[PDB]
Design a protein around this ligand. Structure first.
Ligand SMILES: [Cl-]
Ligand code: NA
Ligand code: NA
Ligand code: NA
Lengths: 186, 206
């Protein structure tokens, strides 16, 4: 039953984006406010190499099956950095409690969203290609660096990229909900 | 005799995630400028562009139409002020269209009293999304808030309406006139301004 899955997918996605957003802010206000970290954030996202729609018209031009697989690849691709984000932060001596609680919730909710999406794929395209080809993140040594300025900016990009991708996923789900269930008459 | 002061890009906004506009202001304490030039590039590009439209957003503004606007891609932008004596550049401004979204106010706010049979009467509020937002494709998502108050009350009553375009308010004082406004935000972004007020007299026999 599509309508219940989508509703729940979009509740999760919007919640995840909201948390990524507040996490990035809180990290910024209390670690990077004073510096040019934003200028170092440019082009730094492990998913940028995927072919993603950048506007409503590209979104519309995109085959539905491919669009869904795209959301799946993006989410699969974030399992790994979210895991190390939580691990690294939790392992700190005096770890920022508001930042850590978001990261943990995002980590858990991302998994659940991926299940709802998997359920959606196998309902809407039941004879699908069963092939992972998501982009690899391999930024763990930079989170682990001892040069504190370099560390803070690896983190900054990670949170900056998480805020973007969580937004994007959320928006793409809304497009697909409207197209699949409502023929674009939401 | 003086070249221009250092100008500032102080505001960008997108009404609907399809276009956006930026505004700058002349620096104070420098010469009068006779020209401005806004240039930018986007993340992952090198290629430098000019503002594509200096007219549409009015004075000291750059407007990016649909063919120049995209989400999830930083714009790195700068404005220069020039006169015959010299020139001055703004700080670079980093902008993601994704985070400057603020819709215009909802439209056609209409209000009515409804007194049905042997069931509580209600105020029934109706409105429409701003024009030029695409809700139908799921590109855009809007949430709405209503406020209302009689003249001279110290506080507004606020009612969250989520994604609905109509709403029901039960407990109102019979005989009181209320001012009603509506506003809206994107699922992510900033609230619009409040719509203009409509006024409603709640009758005596309520
Ligand atoms: Cl706001
Ligand atoms: Na605009
Ligand atoms: Na202008
Ligand atoms: Na565009």
């Amino acid at each position: 039953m599509l309508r219940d899955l989508f509703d729940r997918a979009v509740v999760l996605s919007h919640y995840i984006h909201n948390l990524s957003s507040e996490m990035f802010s809180e990290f910024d206000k209390r670690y990077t406010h004073g510096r040019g970290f934003i200028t170092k954030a440019i082009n730094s996202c492990h998913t940028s190499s995927l072919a993603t729609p950048e506007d409503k018209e590209q979104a519309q031009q995109m085959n539905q099956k491919d669009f869904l697989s795209l959301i799946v690849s993006i989410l699969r691709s974030w399992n790994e950095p979210l895991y190390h984000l939580v691990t690294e932060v939790r392992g700190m001596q005096e770890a920022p409690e508001a930042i850590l609680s978001k990261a943990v919730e995002i980590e858990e909710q991302t998994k659940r969203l991926l299940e709802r999406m998997e359920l959606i794929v196998s309902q809407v395209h039941p004879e699908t290609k069963e092939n992972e080809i998501y982009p690899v993140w391999s930024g763990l040594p930079s989170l682990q660096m001892a040069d504190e300025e370099s560390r803070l900016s690896a983190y900054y990009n990670l949170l900056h990229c998480l805020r973007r991708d969580s937004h994007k996923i959320d928006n793409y789900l809304k497009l697909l909900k409207c197209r699949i269930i409502h023929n674009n008459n939401c | 005799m003086l070249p221009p002061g250092k100008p500032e890009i102080f505001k960008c906004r997108s009404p609907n995630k399809e276009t956006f506009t930026c505004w700058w202001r002349p620096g104070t304490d420098g010469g009068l400028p006779t020209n401005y030039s806004l240039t930018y590039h986007r993340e992952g590009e090198t290629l430098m562009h000019e503002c594509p439209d200096y007219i549409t957003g009015g004075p000291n503004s750059c407007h990016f139409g649909k063919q120049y606007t995209s989400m999830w891609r930083t714009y790195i932008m700068m404005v220069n002020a020039t006169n015959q004596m010299g020139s001055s550049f703004s700080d670079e401004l980093y902008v993601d269209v994704t985070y400057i979204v603020q819709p215009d106010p909802p439209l056609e706010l209409a209000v009515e009293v409804k007194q049905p049979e042997d069931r509580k009467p209600y105020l029934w509020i109706k409105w429409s999304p701003p024009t030029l937002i695409d809700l139908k494709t799921g590109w855009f998502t809007l949430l709405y808030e209503i406020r209302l108050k009689p003249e001279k009350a110290a506080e507004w009553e606020i009612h969250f309406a989520g994604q609905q375009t109509e709403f029901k308010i039960l407990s109102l004082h019979p005989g009181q006139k209320y001012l009603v406004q509506v506003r809206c935000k994107p699922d992510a972004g900033y609230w619009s301004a409040w719509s203009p007020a409509t006024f409603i007299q709640i009758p005596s026999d309520f």
